[PDB]
Each structure stands twice: as structure tokens, then as C-alpha cells.
Enzyme design. Structure first.
Site, PDB file in Angstrom:
ATOM      1  N   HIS A 116       0.811  -1.214   0.000  1.00 50.22           N
ATOM      2  CA  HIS A 116       0.000   0.000   0.000  1.00 50.22           C
ATOM      3  C   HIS A 116       0.846   1.267   0.000  1.00 50.22           C
ATOM      4  O   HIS A 116       0.357   2.319  -0.425  1.00 50.22           O
ATOM      5  CB  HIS A 116      -0.974  -0.015   1.196  1.00 50.22           C
ATOM      6  N   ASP A 165      -0.531  -7.319   2.041  1.00 47.28           N
ATOM      7  CA  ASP A 165       0.061  -5.984   1.982  1.00 47.28           C
ATOM      8  C   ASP A 165       1.571  -6.123   2.164  1.00 47.28           C
ATOM      9  O   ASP A 165       2.136  -5.856   3.227  1.00 47.28           O
ATOM     10  CB  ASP A 165      -0.558  -5.079   3.041  1.00 47.28           C
ATOM     11  N   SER A 266       4.112   3.504   7.411  1.00 42.86           N
ATOM     12  CA  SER A 266       3.775   2.405   6.510  1.00 42.86           C
ATOM     13  C   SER A 266       5.013   1.755   5.909  1.00 42.86           C
ATOM     14  O   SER A 266       5.967   2.431   5.518  1.00 42.86           O
ATOM     15  CB  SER A 266       2.884   2.918   5.378  1.00 42.86           C
TER      16      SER A 266
END
Ligand SMILES: Nc1nc2c(CC(=O)Nc3ccc(Cc4ccncc4)cc3)cccc2[nH]1
EC number: 3.4.21.104
Length: 319
Positions: A116, A165, A266
Site C-alpha cells: 500500500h 500488503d 507504513s
């Protein structure tokens, strides 16, 4: 009768033992690596020119040895955390070009991150601006690297959940491994024994703190693994769709909410210490969680890396 000069070893050297430029039958050479930060694999480096006309090793292999970078070192051995010192997270990688995100160095030419974090920029056909060796996010002094290819997991559905992910970035050049830059170890099969419930893992990153802005300096938190049912039930409410927490995810954080990772963290590596090898390894990748970071009873959700070892070894070996 003559094997010719030997092949150069990446992150290693060549030395003629019989004599300089002696390449004939039974001529002895030695391969080696910078044993501080690399370690020879495959064979002992002793190679002899054999009757079948090519350099061959003690085990009978005709291919080069491999100088694999030493992993998992740390100077120790983001909501609610403390500043990382130099050498604490030498695998840490900043990824710019879209919004702020992170990754973790594997070997000297690969970066593990979240799909992502890098999906939008790969599909725009733009190389990733990758930086490491620096604690300060906005510093001009850093080690520069660039993406050659980006491999996103084939079961990842962007903006439709966070299962699979996970992504891999191939750096177009090798990074120099020193005390400041060092990769993280991939987990071994028994590494789940260090990732039971209440076992501590460390997330690090430049993301939002409790003040609500990105950190200028690298921060980190120690947080414990949460029971999977307890985490699935925590996200079984609106706005989350059904089945948001999958079996390919672990959760980490407090019931009280004091410690978490947020936006901007992230793709960072949630790492755990193997107390027997005394090496840090990657257990999770920073994926998702509640929008209000640090919310009590809303644990940070991380991609379970040990499920993706065959995928990781597929891509790194084949590319
Ligand atoms: N604590 C926490 N927040 C984080 C964020 C921000 C974030 O990801 N916010 C978000 C919340 C919910 C959804 C919906 C959804 C749909 C399907 N499956 C799961 C969730 C999307 C994004 C990024 C990185 C690490 C994070 N650590």
C-alpha cells in the site's frame, strides 16, 4: 589446460595462491569476503582449475561463492515512543516520491515494505526515491538508492483491504554495508517461538506522534503481540468491512492505546530479537490500524511476514 582469469566476486575479492596470473591445471585461487559485514556462503573459497576446463571448488561446485551481508545487528541488543539512536535500526529505509513511507533493507540490494505504501508510484512508472543511513527525515546527508523494479504481491488489492500488503523493491545498485547501514534478518521457521502473545516487538518510523505531525527524527516503540481473536473482534465494527483482520496479519499494541504506529510509518519493519542467535529479524510490516492512532483497544495491524517467505525467496532468487 588453461582456465583463464577468474570471475570477480561481488562484495569479495580474488587471490592467486599458486602465483599471479597462474591459471593452468591445478592452479589454486582463493575467494574471500569482507568478513566483518559479509559472510561467505556455498563453499570455503578454495577453487582449483580442473580437467573439465573451469574453476571448481572443494565441494565440486563450478559457480562463484556468495558474500551474504550480515543481518540483524543493532546498537540496542510512532505514538508513545522514544528517539532512536544511531545504529539502533540500521535497516531503516525512508521512501519518498508520493507520501512519506518506510521500508527495511534486506541483503544490500532489496527493500521490504508494504504494498500500500508503493502501489501508486509503481503504477505511475516512476522510480522510488529511497534513502537510508540517516535518522533525520529531511536531512540532505543520506545514502541514496533508486528502485530497479518493484514487486507487489499478486493477491494484494489496493484500497480494498490489506491482505497480502507486502512488496519488494529491487535497488538498482548495491548499498555499502557498515555499522550505520545493515539489513534485517528474515525470520527462520522457528521464529514464531519469539512471536507468541505478549512477546515484545519494536516498530520504528517517522510517522505521526501523539502531537499529530510527522517526526523529524526516527522514533520507535516496544509493543506486545495481541491475541488474534482479540484483534479480529476489535475491528469487527463499522467503518471496517467484514474480515478485515486476516490470518496473514498479526496485531500489536496496548488495550490502553498508549503505544502504536500511525500514518507515515507504513512499510516499516516490526522486528523481534532472537535471543539465541542474538539477532533482530522482521516479524511484521507496518500495514494499517485505526484512523485515530493510539486509540485504546484498537491495535496496530501488521502483515505477517513469516507467511510470505516462499514469496520473498521466489522473487529474490529469480530476480
Ligand atoms: N494505527 C495505525 N493507523 C495506520 C495508518 C493509517 C490507516 O491505515 N488508516 C486506515 C484505517 C482504516 C481503513 C479501512 C480498512 C479497510 C479494510 N481493511 C482494513 C481497514 C483504511 C485506512 C497507516 C499506517 C500505519 C497505521 N497504524
Amino acid at each position: 589446460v588453461d582456465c583463464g582469469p577468474p570471475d570477480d566476486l561481488p562484495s569479495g575479492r580474488v587471490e592467486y595462491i599458486t602465483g599471479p596470473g597462474v591459471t593452468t591445471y591445478k592452479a589454486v585461487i582463493q575467494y574471500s569476503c569482507e568478513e566483518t559485514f559479509y559472510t561467505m556462503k556455498v563453499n570455503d573459497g578454495k577453487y582449483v582449475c580442473e580437467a573439465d576446463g573451469f574453476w571448481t571448488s572443494s565441494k565440486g561446485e563450478k559457480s562463484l561463492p556468495v558474500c551474504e551481508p550480515v543481518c540483524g545487528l543493532s546498537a540496542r541488543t510512532i505514538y508513545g515512543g522514544q528517539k532512536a539512536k544511531p545504529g539502533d535500526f540500521p535497516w531503516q529505509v525512508l521512501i519518498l516520491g508520493g507520501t512519506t513511507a518506510a521500508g527495511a533493507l534486506l541483503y544490500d540490494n532489496w527493500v521490504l515494505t508494504a504494498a500500500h505504501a508503493v502501489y501508486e508510484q509503481k503504477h505511475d512508472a516512476s522510480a522510488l526515491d529511497i534513502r537510508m543511513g540517516t535518522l533525520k527525515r529531511l536531512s540532505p546527508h543520506y545514502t541514496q538508492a533508486w528502485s530497479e523494479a518493484v514487486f507487489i504481491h499478486e493477491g494484494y488489492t489496493h484500497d480494498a483491504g490489506f491482505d497480502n500488503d507486502i512488496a519488494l523493491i529491487k535497488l538498482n545498485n548495491k548499498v555499502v554495508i557498515n555499522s550505520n547501514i545493515t539489513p534485517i534478518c528474515l525470520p527462520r521457521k522457528e521464529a514464531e517461538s519469539f512471536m507468541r502473545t505478549d512477546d515484545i516487538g519494536t516498530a520504528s518510523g517517522w510517522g505521526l506522534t501523539q502531537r499529530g505531525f510527522l517526526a523529524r527524527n526516527l522514533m520507535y516503540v516496544d509493543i506486545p503481540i495481541v491475541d488474534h481473536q482479540k484483534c479480529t473482534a476489535a475491528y469487527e465494527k463499522p467503518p471496517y468491512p467484514r474480515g478485515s483482520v486476516t490470518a496473514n496479519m498479526l496485531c500489536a499494541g496496548l488495550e490502553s492505546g498508549g503505544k502504536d504506529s500511525c500514518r507515515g510509518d507504513s512499510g516499516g519493519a516490526l522486528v523481534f530479537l532472537d535471543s539465541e542467535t542474538e539477532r533482530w529479524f522482521v516479524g511484521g510490516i507496518v500495514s494499517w490500524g485505526s484512523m485515530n492512532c493510539g486509540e485504546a483497544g484498537q491495535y496496530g495491524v501488521y502483515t505477517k511476514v513469516i507467511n510470505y517467505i516462499p514469496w520473498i525467496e521466489n522473487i529474490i532468487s529469480d530476480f
